Design a protein around this ligand. Structure first.
Ligand code: ZN
Ligand code: ZN
Lengths: 134, 113, 109, 134
């Protein structure tokens, strides 16, 4: 069982209902110490719209904050990788732009051709370490 | 420990950082899902910027311990202005001379422009 | 006046422009032989920036706006014609901001 | 003949001796009120190196200042157009980034495919006008 269950609100991102579910499924099946659950008085929320900066996340790195998903960027880059990547920031992982496609937290670094939405061994280990004692 | 998107301008200025002072070099950097900007190495620069954890003085936390610098005065100033982890910031640091600058920054990818 | 390269960061902040204030939008712009940056229209942006002739207050050139209080700031930081600059302006609300800027390509991001 | 002869120093740009020479020939054959002298104790100078910003000019716009030519940019964009364009700033012309390839002062605006190094009649006349009494 998880040490913590983190609640997310996907209601403000109707265009990304599937990729938000995909992200939660990828993470829940990748880590054991923390689990994601859809709900109402959520720890963090998903938003959508247009931003010249693209998709991003504004978070404390421990389940609280919000994720913004940009319309144009999610048409050029794989939406599930984008959503899973940003969910990784709320779980406490930083970006590693110099990383390869096998590294989910490299984000857009390896380019738009990169479609891998799964966190690697080191990433899965880091998230388990961060959520080990809640 | 706060995470957010960043959009910054970095500059190196000849002198104390006075209004009339010559801007030797400048570059832009943007970190969100993608690392971009006019920076010659955005991926490396964005990674180096995130290592500071919001405190830009940490761009000086790893100096060259063996580089022996002259103790003369020919001031050089580095600046950083913009959005850092979703919050507006302004930082500057003036070094005694260019050697002191080279040694303190120790080829930090942020100022590798 | 004087001509030089420019490398700027433009922002729109929720509020007075305090350190804890939320950044609503931000972009980068660079003008030299080429107009580039993360700005959606760099060519138009760079020409609009050069039209000010160094005075960023010239970006403000004034329908009827309602009188509600919800402050918002526009900022500009970086290198303008080879000289380091820092500028900000606070509007009482977003309608008043749109009225004063009147679709200036610099804030068209 | 001309009203003023402006001296330039190309010595600090050995990799661009040919394009500096082409720029001076383009302007000397395009305007009559001002002419560019091969060298000496110059009014303005040419430099070369590496700048993330690329090529640029720092000038008062009335023959004084300097032009910096970037190595990488001059391999992607036509070197003669770059050099002639920047020489135009020292002659007092501004940039018009939205302008077409027929406009020398549009610079890199029309893209790397643009190779025109000659100023159109409107550019040529403003320069003749700025050096008429100046
Ligand atoms: Zn990221
Ligand atoms: Zn130009």
């Amino acid at each position: 069982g998880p040490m913590v269950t983190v609640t997310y609100d996907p209601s403000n991102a109707p265009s990304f209902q599937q990729e938000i579910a995909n992200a939660a499924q990828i993470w829940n099946s990748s880590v054991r110490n923390v689990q994601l659950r859809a709900g109402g008085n959520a720890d963090f929320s998903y938003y959508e719209g247009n931003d010249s900066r693209g998709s991003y996340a504004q978070t404390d790195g421990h389940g609280r904050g919000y994720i913004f998903l940009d319309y144009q960027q999610n048409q050029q880059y794989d939406s599930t990788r984008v959503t899973a990547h940003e969910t990784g920031h709320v779980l406490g992982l930083p970006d590693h732009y110099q990383g390869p496609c096998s590294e989910l937290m490299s984000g857009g670094g390896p380019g738009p051709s990169c479609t891998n939405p799964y966190p690697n061994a080191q990433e899965r280990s880091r998230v388990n370490a961060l959520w080990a004692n809640g | 420990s706060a995470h957010g998107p960043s959009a910054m301008v970095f500059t190196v200025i000849q002198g104390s950082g006075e209004p009339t002072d010559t801007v030797l070099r400048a570059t832009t950097l943007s970190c969100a899902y993608t690392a971009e900007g006019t920076h010659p190495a955005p991926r490396a620069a964005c990674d180096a910027l995130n290592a500071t954890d919001g405190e830009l003085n940490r761009l000086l936390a790893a100096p060259d311990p063996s580089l022996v610098c002259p103790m003369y005065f020919d001031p050089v100033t580095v600046t950083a202005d913009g959005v850092l982890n979703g919050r507006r910031v302004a930082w500057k640091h003036t070094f005694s001379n260019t050697c002191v600058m080279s040694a303190n920054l120790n080829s930090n990818p942020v100022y590798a422009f």
